């Protein structure tokens, strides 16, 4: 079974659902909505509200202005995919489909860190949180795609599967290299309070000659 949660709730500004009914119609990417209220002044001095029409565009997030990059660069890769020959042998075609996968990942990444700079450049913290939320969605997409690539497209065998899964974690759990820069930038790296946390986290990422070099500062 499927769709056993609450159905996705859009809030419309001004519209007073708390008793007022609605009429609507469907265009190619936009649905109209209009409300059944009109405010025939019971003696108050205030401006009477006219009725209002609302143009309600599809949630499929196509209208985040950065993601237009994602759609065109991925369509170029999709025509780069529907033009692959089926008789291309299970080593040439498999290498080429692993490239198609890594091309799509490169576009997710190249939209995400552009949007990360736009979140830093956001001169209102509300807008910075909206971009930061879509950066987290693109991060979740490239996390899932990096796993699905290892398991289903490159299909990593026993042994190499662990190497693939170590740098799978590393290319998304980027916390460690940021912490490495702050610990190494200090006057005495073995006396930054997070130094032992970082030594352990490098061992938890299997980065053993990097952990050995941190242990050398002790």
């Amino acid at each position: 079974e499927e769709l056993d949660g609450e159905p996705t709730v859009t809030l419309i500004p001004g519209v007073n659902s708390k008793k007022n009914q609605m009429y609507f119609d469907w265009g190619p990417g936009e649905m109209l909505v209009c409300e059944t209220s009109f405010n025939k002044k019971e003696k108050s001095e205030m401006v009477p509200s006219c009725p209002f029409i609302y143009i309600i565009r599809k949630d499929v997030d196509v209208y985040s202005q950065i993601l237009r990059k994602l759609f065109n660069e991925s369509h170029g890769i999709f025509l780069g995919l529907q033009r692959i020959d089926e008789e291309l042998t299970g080593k040439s075609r498999k290498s080429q489909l692993v490239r198609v996968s890594k091309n799509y990942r490169s576009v997710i990444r190249a939209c995400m860190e552009e949007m990360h700079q736009v979140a830093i450049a956001a001169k209102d913290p509300a807008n910075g949180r909206q971009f930061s939320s879509q950066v987290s969605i693109l991060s979740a997409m490239e996390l899932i795609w990096n796993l699905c690539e290892i398991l289903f497209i490159e299909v990593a065998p026993a042994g190499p599967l662990l190497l693939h899964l170590l740098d799978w974690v590393r290319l998304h759990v980027c916390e460690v290299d940021s912490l490495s820069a702050d610990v190494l930038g200090s006057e005495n790296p073995s006396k930054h309070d997070s130094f032992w946390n970082l030594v352990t986290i490098l061992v938890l990422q299997g980065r053993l000659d990097e952990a050995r070099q941190m242990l050398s500062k002790e």
Partner: peptide, 11 residues
Amino acid sequence: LSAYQRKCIQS
């Protein structure tokens, strides 16, 4: 020097 490029030269 980056904290990885300092590591490189130390290594």
